[PDB]
GROMACS .gro file of C-alpha atoms in nm:
model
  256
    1UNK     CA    1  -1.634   1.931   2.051
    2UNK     CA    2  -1.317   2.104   2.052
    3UNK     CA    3  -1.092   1.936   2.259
    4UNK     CA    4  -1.216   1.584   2.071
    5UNK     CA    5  -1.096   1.756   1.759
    6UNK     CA    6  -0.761   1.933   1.868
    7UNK     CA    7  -0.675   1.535   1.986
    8UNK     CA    8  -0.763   1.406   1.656
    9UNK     CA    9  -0.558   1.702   1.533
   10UNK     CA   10  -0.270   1.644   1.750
   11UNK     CA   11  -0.307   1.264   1.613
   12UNK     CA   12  -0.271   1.371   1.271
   13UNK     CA   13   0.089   1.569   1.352
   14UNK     CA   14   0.208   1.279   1.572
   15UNK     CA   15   0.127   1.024   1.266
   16UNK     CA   16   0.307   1.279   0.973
   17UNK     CA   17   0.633   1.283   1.243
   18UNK     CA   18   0.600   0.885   1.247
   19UNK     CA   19   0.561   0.916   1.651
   20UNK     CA   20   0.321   0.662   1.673
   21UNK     CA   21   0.322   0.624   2.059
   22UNK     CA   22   0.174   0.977   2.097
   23UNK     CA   23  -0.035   0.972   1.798
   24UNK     CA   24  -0.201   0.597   1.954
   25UNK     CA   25  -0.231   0.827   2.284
   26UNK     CA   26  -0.369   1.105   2.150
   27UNK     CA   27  -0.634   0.916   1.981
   28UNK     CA   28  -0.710   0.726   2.313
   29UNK     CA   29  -0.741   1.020   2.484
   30UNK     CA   30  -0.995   1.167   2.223
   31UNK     CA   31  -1.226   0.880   2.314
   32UNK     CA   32  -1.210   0.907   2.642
   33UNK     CA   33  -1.318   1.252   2.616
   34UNK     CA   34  -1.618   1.168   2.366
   35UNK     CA   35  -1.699   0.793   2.433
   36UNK     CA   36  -2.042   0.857   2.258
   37UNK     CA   37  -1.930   1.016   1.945
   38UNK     CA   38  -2.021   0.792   1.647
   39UNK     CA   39  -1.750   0.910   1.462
   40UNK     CA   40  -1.514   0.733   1.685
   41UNK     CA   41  -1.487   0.405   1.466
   42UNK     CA   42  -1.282   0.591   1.203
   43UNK     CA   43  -1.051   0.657   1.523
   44UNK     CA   44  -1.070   0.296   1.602
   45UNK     CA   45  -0.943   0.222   1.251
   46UNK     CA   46  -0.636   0.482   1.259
   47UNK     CA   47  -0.566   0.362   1.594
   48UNK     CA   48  -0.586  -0.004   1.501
   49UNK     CA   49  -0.317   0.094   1.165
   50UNK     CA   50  -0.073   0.345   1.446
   51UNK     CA   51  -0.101   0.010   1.669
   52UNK     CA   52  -0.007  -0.263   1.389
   53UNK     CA   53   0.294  -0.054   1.264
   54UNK     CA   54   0.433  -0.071   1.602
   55UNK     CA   55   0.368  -0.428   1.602
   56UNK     CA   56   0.089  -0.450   1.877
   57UNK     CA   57  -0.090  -0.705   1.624
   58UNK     CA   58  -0.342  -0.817   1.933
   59UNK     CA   59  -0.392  -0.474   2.049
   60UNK     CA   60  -0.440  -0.366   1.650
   61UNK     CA   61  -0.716  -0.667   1.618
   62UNK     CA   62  -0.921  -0.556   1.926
   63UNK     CA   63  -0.901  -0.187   1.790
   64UNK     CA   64  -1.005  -0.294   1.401
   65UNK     CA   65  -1.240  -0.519   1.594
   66UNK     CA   66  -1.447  -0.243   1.784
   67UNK     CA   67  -1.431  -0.046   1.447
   68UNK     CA   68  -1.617  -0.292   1.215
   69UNK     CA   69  -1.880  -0.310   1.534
   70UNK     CA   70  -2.166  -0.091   1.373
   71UNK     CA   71  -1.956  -0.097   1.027
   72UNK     CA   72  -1.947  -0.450   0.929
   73UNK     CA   73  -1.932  -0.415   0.570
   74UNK     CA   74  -1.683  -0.146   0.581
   75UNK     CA   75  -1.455  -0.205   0.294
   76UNK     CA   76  -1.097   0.014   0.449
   77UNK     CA   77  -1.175  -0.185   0.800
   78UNK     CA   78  -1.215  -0.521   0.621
   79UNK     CA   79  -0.902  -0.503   0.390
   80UNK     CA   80  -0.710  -0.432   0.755
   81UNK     CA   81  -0.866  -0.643   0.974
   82UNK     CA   82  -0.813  -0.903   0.694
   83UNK     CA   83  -0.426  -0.796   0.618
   84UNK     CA   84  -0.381  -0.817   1.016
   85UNK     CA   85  -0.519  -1.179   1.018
   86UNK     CA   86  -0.295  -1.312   0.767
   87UNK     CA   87  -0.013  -1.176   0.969
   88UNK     CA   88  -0.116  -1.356   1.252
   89UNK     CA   89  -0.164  -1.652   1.065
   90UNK     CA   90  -0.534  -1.665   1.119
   91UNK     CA   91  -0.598  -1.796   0.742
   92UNK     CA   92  -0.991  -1.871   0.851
   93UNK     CA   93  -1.060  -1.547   0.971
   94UNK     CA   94  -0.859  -1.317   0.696
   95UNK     CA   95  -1.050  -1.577   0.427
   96UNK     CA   96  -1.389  -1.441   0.627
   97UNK     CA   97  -1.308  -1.092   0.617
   98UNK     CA   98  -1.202  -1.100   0.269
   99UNK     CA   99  -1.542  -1.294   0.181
  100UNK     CA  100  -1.769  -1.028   0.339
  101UNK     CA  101  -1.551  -0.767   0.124
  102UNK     CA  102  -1.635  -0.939  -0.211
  103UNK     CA  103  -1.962  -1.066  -0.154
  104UNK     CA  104  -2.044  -0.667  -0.094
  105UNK     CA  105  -1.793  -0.569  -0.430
  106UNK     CA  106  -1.712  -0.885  -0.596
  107UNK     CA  107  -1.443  -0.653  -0.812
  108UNK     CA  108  -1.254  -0.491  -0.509
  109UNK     CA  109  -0.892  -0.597  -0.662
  110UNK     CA  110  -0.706  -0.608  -0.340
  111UNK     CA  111  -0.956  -0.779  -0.148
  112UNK     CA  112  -0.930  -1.054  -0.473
  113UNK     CA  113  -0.578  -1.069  -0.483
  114UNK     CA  114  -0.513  -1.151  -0.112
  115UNK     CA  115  -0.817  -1.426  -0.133
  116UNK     CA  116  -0.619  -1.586  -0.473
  117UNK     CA  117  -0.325  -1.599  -0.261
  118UNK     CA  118  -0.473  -1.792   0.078
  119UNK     CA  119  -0.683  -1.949  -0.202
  120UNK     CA  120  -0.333  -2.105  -0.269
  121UNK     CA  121  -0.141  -2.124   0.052
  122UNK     CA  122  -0.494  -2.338   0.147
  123UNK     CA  123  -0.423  -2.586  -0.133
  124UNK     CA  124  -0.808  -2.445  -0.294
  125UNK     CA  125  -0.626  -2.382  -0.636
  126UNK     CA  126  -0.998  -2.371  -0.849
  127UNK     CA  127  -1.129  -2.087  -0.600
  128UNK     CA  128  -0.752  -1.885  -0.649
  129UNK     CA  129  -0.778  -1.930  -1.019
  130UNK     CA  130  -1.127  -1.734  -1.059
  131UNK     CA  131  -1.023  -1.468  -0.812
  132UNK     CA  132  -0.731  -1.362  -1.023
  133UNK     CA  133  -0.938  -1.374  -1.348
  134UNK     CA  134  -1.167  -1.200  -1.158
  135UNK     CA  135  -0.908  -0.914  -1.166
  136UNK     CA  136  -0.786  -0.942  -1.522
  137UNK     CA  137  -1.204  -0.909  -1.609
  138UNK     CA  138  -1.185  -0.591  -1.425
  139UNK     CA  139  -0.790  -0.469  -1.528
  140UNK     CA  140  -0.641  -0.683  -1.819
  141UNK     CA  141  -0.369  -0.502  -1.755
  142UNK     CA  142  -0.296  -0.645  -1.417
  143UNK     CA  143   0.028  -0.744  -1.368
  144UNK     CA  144  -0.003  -0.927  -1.015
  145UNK     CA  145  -0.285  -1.115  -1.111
  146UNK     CA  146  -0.108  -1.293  -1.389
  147UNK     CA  147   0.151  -1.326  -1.129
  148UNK     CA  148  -0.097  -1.508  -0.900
  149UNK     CA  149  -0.138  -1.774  -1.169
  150UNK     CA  150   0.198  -1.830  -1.241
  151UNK     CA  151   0.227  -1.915  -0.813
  152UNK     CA  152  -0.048  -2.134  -0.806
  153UNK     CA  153   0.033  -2.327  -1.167
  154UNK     CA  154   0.398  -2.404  -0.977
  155UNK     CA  155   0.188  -2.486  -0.628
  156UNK     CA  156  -0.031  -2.694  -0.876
  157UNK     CA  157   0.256  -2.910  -1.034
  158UNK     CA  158   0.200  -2.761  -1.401
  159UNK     CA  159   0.571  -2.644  -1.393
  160UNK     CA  160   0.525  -2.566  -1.775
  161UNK     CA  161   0.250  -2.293  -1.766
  162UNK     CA  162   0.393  -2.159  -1.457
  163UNK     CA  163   0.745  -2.102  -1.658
  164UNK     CA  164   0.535  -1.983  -1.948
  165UNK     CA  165   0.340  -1.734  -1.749
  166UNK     CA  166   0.725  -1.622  -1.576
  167UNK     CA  167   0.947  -1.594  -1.903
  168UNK     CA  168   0.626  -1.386  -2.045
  169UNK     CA  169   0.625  -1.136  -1.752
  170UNK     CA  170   1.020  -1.126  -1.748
  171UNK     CA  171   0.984  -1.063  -2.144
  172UNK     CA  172   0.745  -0.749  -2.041
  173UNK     CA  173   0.950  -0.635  -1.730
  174UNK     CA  174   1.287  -0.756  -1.825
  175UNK     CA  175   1.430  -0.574  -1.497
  176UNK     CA  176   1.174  -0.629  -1.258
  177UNK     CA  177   1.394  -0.826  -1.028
  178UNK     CA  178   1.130  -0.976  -0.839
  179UNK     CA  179   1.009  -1.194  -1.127
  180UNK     CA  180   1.328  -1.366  -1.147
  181UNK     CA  181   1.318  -1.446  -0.780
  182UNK     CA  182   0.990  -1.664  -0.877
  183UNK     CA  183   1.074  -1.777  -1.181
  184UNK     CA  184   1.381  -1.904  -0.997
  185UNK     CA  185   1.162  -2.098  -0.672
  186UNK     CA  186   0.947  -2.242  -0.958
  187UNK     CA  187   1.291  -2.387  -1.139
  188UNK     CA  188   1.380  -2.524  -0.790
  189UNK     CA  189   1.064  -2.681  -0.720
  190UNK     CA  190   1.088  -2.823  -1.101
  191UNK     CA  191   1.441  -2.991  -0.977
  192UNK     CA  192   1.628  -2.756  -1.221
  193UNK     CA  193   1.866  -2.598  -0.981
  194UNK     CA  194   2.175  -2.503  -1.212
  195UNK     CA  195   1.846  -2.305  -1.395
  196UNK     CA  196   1.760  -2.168  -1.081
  197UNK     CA  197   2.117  -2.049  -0.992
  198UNK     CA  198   2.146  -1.861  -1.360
  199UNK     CA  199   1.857  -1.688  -1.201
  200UNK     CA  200   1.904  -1.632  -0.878
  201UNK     CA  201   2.319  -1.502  -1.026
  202UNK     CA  202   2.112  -1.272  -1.193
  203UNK     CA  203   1.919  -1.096  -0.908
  204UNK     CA  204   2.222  -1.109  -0.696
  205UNK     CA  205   2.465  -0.915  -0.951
  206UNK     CA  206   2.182  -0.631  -1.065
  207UNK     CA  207   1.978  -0.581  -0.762
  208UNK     CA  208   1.968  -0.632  -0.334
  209UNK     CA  209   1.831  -1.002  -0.309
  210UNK     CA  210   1.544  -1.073   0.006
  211UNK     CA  211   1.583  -1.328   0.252
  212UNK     CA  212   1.366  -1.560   0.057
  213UNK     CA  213   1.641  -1.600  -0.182
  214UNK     CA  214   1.901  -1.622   0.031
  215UNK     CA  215   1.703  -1.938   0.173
  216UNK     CA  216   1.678  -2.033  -0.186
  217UNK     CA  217   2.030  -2.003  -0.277
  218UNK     CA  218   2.134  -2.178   0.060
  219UNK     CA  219   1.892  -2.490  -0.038
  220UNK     CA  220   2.046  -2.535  -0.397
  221UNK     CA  221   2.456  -2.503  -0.171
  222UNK     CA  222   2.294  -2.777  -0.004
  223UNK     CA  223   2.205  -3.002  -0.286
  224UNK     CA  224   2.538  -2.940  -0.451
  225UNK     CA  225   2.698  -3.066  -0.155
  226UNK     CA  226   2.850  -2.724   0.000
  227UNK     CA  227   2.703  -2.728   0.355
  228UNK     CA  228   2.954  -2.433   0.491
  229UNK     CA  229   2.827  -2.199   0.187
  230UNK     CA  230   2.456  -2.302   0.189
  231UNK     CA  231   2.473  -2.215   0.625
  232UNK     CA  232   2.635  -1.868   0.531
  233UNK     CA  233   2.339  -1.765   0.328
  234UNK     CA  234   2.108  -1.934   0.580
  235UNK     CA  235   2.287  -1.723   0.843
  236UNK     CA  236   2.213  -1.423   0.614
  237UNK     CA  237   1.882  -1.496   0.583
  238UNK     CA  238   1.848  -1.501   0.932
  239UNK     CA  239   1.989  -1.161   1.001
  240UNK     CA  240   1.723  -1.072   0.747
  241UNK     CA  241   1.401  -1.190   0.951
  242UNK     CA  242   1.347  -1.515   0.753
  243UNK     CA  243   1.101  -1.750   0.972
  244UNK     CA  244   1.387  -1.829   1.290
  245UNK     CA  245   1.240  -2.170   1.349
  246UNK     CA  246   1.297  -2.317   0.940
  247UNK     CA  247   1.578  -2.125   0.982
  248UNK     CA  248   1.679  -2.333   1.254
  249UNK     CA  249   1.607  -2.668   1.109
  250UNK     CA  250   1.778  -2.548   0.743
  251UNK     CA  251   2.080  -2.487   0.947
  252UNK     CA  252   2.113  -2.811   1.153
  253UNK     CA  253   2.124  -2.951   0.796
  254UNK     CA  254   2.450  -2.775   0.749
  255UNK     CA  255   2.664  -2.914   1.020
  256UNK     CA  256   2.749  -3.273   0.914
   0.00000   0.00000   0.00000
């Protein structure tokens, strides 16, 4: 009908003028006024997206939820639902998701990329190797995926392919900051913190540093024995959104 589509319409102008509020009404109010309409699980999935960006994550789960309903092996509602999970630390159920993407394409690269990384963060370091060869069978070219091997080589405790795979990728991208912020976590982890700092110097004089390295920086203060430095950058990385409770305990370290 017409007034289901000027809704959607109005949804679409709402989203490109990022007022999410009305565009997550408007698309409400089209499904009220078609609750039959089996097109209405592609407005579940916009909705679900309009509701995460305003950070409604349970309200954005129940939407991608109701979505996958009669689409379960959707591939856009999967990769969301999947994305959203992770976010709210719901490793299981992203993993789940991102297994009933790749069991239906085994070569979806993002699906594999995200399922390397969990793969990692859930200490399964065989299953996160063969997802990011996966992706170099498929794109040799991939960058990330060689990326994903140097993380879980470091996670691993072979420090020396990790650092291989890092001063390769820095030789390639020689000012792709975000390498260096890697290669410089792996040199801490390694002990090599003088390394690190030549490293994390380097980001900090070229480039705007995240939060993640302000953290790092603050941990190597610490181990050189400069408490009232390392708590400034932990302060810093604070004001940044770094994790508020490990923020909290990194801190308390700091005040002798």
């Amino acid at each position: 009908g017409q007034s289901y589509e000027e809704l959607i319409e109005k949804s679409y102008d709402f989203v490109d003028k990022g007022d999410l509020v009305s565009a997550e009404e408007s698309l409400k109010a089209a499904m009220r006024k078609e609750p039959a309409n089996p097109l209405n699980y592609a407005l579940l999935t916009n909705l679900g997206t309009i509701q995460r960006r305003q950070g409604k994550l349970q309200e954005a789960l129940i939407s991608y939820t109701s979505a996958l309903s009669g689409h379960t092996k959707n591939i856009t509602i999967l990769e969301n639902r999947a994305s959203l999970y992770t976010e709210l630390g719901e490793t299981e159920k992203a993993l789940n998701d991102y297994n009933t993407l790749l069991i239906e394409n085994p070569e979806h690269q993002e699906a594999l990329y995200c399922r390397g990384l969990l793969y990692i963060q859930l200490q399964n370091y065989m299953w996160a190797e063969q997802d990011f060869d996966k992706i170099l069978e498929v794109n040799e070219k991939s960058v990330r995926a060689r990326l994903g091997h140097a993380i879980l080589e470091k996670m691993r405790g072979n420090y020396d392919e990790s650092e291989r795979i890092f001063n390769y990728l820095i030789s390639e991208m020689p000012r792709d900051w975000i390498l260096y912020e890697g290669r410089a976590d792996l040199y801490f982890m390694m002990g090599k913190n003088a390394r690190a700092m030549a490293d994390i110097e380097k980001v900090f004089t070229e480039s705007e540093p995240t939060a993640n390295l302000y953290v790092l920086r603050g941990k190597i203060k610490l181990a050189q024995y400069e408490k009232e430095r390392a708590a400034l950058d932990f302060k810093k990385a604070e004001s940044m959104g770094y994790n508020k409770e490990v923020i909290k305990e990194l801190l308390k370290l700091t005040m002798n």
